[model samples]
Target: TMPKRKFVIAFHASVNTDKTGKNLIKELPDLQKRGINTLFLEIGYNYQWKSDPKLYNKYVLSETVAREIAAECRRLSIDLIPEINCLGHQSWENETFALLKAYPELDETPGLYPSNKDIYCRSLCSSNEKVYTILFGLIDEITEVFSVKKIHVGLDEVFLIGEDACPLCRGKDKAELFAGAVNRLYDHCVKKRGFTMYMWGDRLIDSEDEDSGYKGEYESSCNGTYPAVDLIPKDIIICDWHYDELERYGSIPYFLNKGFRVLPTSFKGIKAVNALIDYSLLYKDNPAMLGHMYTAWDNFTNKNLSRYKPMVKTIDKLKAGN
Candidate 1:
């Protein structure tokens, strides 16, 4: 049996303007023809936000453009789930993205990591109430513009949750803080607003599993956030992304056995993509195994998407149905 849905998600897709959004609008028919029933597009800090006008990014997408793309996706029956980095990925190198730029107080380590000296990426102080005020505002604006029922809050590679530098998050249990953040977002996106919530699965995986080949801090959680897998709501969809060609992917069943739906996501390498797809096929009859997503992290637009090999391989796998 085949999975219920197939996705060709252009992660960090360069679609932040009318021209770029329209280009995607034009490609909908072809994408649907290739069996891509879902599109998990990253509109991360790249939209003309009315909620916070100062938060807009370069060449932001306007209301008209947003509606145009939404209408087209509806017409083609493509489930358009917009994504934004929520808990982690607040800053890169020396620059803060948007949320932290407007409110630097929300930084998990407020004055530390000058120029991001030694950290991988900056994270928001999850215990701060004000963080949600601005974050929920941004989430509301993008979801309303796109008219989507589902939203993917990127929560991967977060290593700075319970840091001692900050006052609020200091000394708190890491798992508690992590689950609080996930539940807080869930309360807003799921219970309050009635929208389905989706998030990256890395933080929820136990990083101590040696037998499963889950060794990295990137692919699994090493800082105590993994125990939150049992703390969070089971309804939230987990986008389980692993870029390496591992001998085994225990995280797939890890999520399923824990009573959550899993969307196995892949990027780039052909061998890795094949390994993930073939491994995911073992759960064909399990309803908790929703489907697969092909993620392209580079500058991909509809004009050149057909030429992308990972997308092509994903389409072939979806067509073949194992």
Candidate 2:
């Protein structure tokens, strides 16, 4: 049997600003019954930022709404972990997020990528000290409002780092640049505030080599920032996510070998789900393996959540411990 104490089905979803939050709160019982014990809730540019009023999104969550969500999680015996996009995911398709919009100087490749063309997503320059001061204020307010001890900082799909055009980060080692950002955040979130930090593990795994078993650049780094894996502290949790149907998941054991607790995350693919489950179960007895996670990507809406097959299969496998 899997270590019941440590193994949990952690679901990633958003803490909505609209009535979606209320609707989501109502759906918590359904989620709880399906064996989800932990939630990684992304507030992402959707909160009233007392830290910086300019950073508030058009869709903002009131302090009451934020607290109510937290309270419901507590009532359900679910661990609520709030998340915000940091370092990467500063902008989406054509719109810059609140953080970068309010402070344009912090963009890693500022003035370039106009309308976010020729780039997947925007990243904040990790070398910018000013960014941290602003980020810490946001983190502090999020922590206070949620009263949560764990936070997931989205460092996934960070396409730009140490760019040639950026003055602050120009010509720096991308790994060190990425590690520096992680270390500084660790200092604040873990050392200073005593909160457990979780991050996407894609940038820490190199898959650029043709010989490597990995195929997707989205799941593994083609960028040179993978060496940050060695530079970061071991205590930080790595949410090792892969969305392909592969014969094996080397990164699960790879992270465990590196002395990190790995949470293997999957999206909505039945074949991919089974592949991840089969590979992850090899280390089911290991304490460092924290079971699996299913990222709904905000697809877990009110009406159709119960019918989502991949999620159903994932949690079913987790509860079965096989």
Candidate 3:
């Protein structure tokens, strides 16, 4: 007989004021009943953009909080992985400290447009020694407190390439540059920090598509045809998230063909319970291929938490193979 498979359910705590520990704790029993074994504790990503000591301090999870949460997850047999944004989506930086101003050399443009404020940002010149120093320091602090074997270093949604401000980045092969930065960052985490690394895989595959143009520019990178699977280290797990039917893309086959452990994450509201079950069945035949993670996100408001009970109940039935 084959060994049992494991599944993970994660709640994205993007906003600081929402999803208190008590609320998370309340959902734990439901998760436990469902056999969901891992939780990705996402602290605010855009917090780093703000330099206001007070506001930054307020949003970012303190060591004390991380420790408490990690300890609780352990007791429940759930691994709580700490997630921090490293490369892109630095919206919180807009009003706080003018990080773009301080590092004009790094800004993709001069002023912050509204669209730029969404998911686009000037790529932090990863070549800069100071950038790594600050980023590693933050990662070190989080790891020291959380004490987990795995860390989700978010290397996703990086824009602002080929811009005039960053001369070094201009005209360079964007995918190569991205892979270099990702490998460097991963080395820091695994070798220096002693933790396994996880990153969003969208950029690795389709970041350069013509349809997915830069925030303000009409021209896209148009390089999505290039595959980055060979560029990144083989050991790293790719979280392939697409809020649609799993069969549409044959995503599992695509990743498995490349010798990758693919974890497909599904959203709660848009997808039905049966869709999630069918996705899990795909995992059944290819045990090594399946890492099903259920995602709960709150992008516009915290109202999504209300769906937690029903979602958790559904997960329980699925885990029981009902």
Candidate 4:
């Protein structure tokens, strides 16, 4: 008999409360029935501080809780991948301590940007060695406890780098800079710690300059534009996520063409559920495509999780089809 195919239902749950844990366990039977084999749990920041420290700390899943959840997933034969925001979007740091503060010179604006209040500030210079040292230490600490083979080192939504912040970073190719930092981060994860790496593909595809009006721009051409992808090992997985239905199908082909192991992700809702089903069918032919992941965002509450149960059923159908 051939090896069984794997399906993943991952979520970026910043606030993992007891209620959240109970709800996740409640849904596991349905997930197991569907042959979903993985759950990527994003347990907010360890260092950063949200506005409400009491509420944030209360809901932020403890290491004990993470271990419990990981243990349960293991019992069910579901691989658990832990996610942490290592770079960019350090607003929580601003609130928590000044050490991890975003370089004031690099930020487009001072204080908290209205878009992300929790993110105290943008990252300090990506080129700084100290930044990598601190980030790697945190990764080491978590990986020691979790023992996760796959780790999601978030390198997404970095809009702080500009000519004004660091003159060295200025006039340099944004894609190369972004990719360079990512590759460095990847090296530490793989070589030092011995773990496979995963990252969001937005930096490669989405235009940060266009979206945020940042001065930096990613070079667009036939050759590989990002320096990070070029430097990093090919085994790394690129998770391509898009909430819009039209963009999901359209972007899938692009990622496949790029020689990447594409794992398409979606949120949990009526539209998201429908879109994931449609995407699986649309891209069923590509085996290098690996699998699909239904992402539950912060919006998912215990009350509304029932509404997303159909998504688990749809994933089950997809597994059966394989």
For residue 169, model 2's alpha carbon misses the true position, in angstroms, by 1.0
My TM-score estimates for the predictions, one after another, are 0.90, 0.93, 0.78, 0.75
If both were scored by TM-score, which would come out higher, candidate 2 or candidate 4?
2
Candidate 2: tens digits of C-alpha lDDT, residues 129-160? 99999989888999899888888888886989
Question: How do the residues 225-318 of candidate 1 rate in per-residue lDDT, one tens digit apiece?
Answer: 8888899999999988888887678988888988998888887687888888778877766867877887664655656554457667666665
lDDT of each: 0.79, 0.82, 0.58, 0.58
> Which one wins on TM-score?
2
- lDDT rank order: 2, 1, 4, 3
Please identify model 1 stretches exceeding 4 Å from their true place: 1-14, 212-222, 300-302, 320-322
- lDDT, candidate 4, 144-165, per-residue tens: 5566777888766555654344
Cα lDDT tens digits for candidate 3, 158-198: 66544455556666676676777778888898877678887
Candidate 4 minimal-lDDT segment of 10 residues: 212-221
Tell me model 3's lDDT, rounded to 2 decimals.
0.58
| Every model: Cα RMSD to truth | 2.8, 2.3, 4.8, 6.1
Give residue 134's lDDT in candidate 2 (0 to 100): 90
Best by lDDT: 2
Candidate 2: give its CA RMSD in angstroms: 2.3
Error of 4 at 83 (Å): 0.7
In model 4, what is the error at residue 212, expressed in angstroms? 18
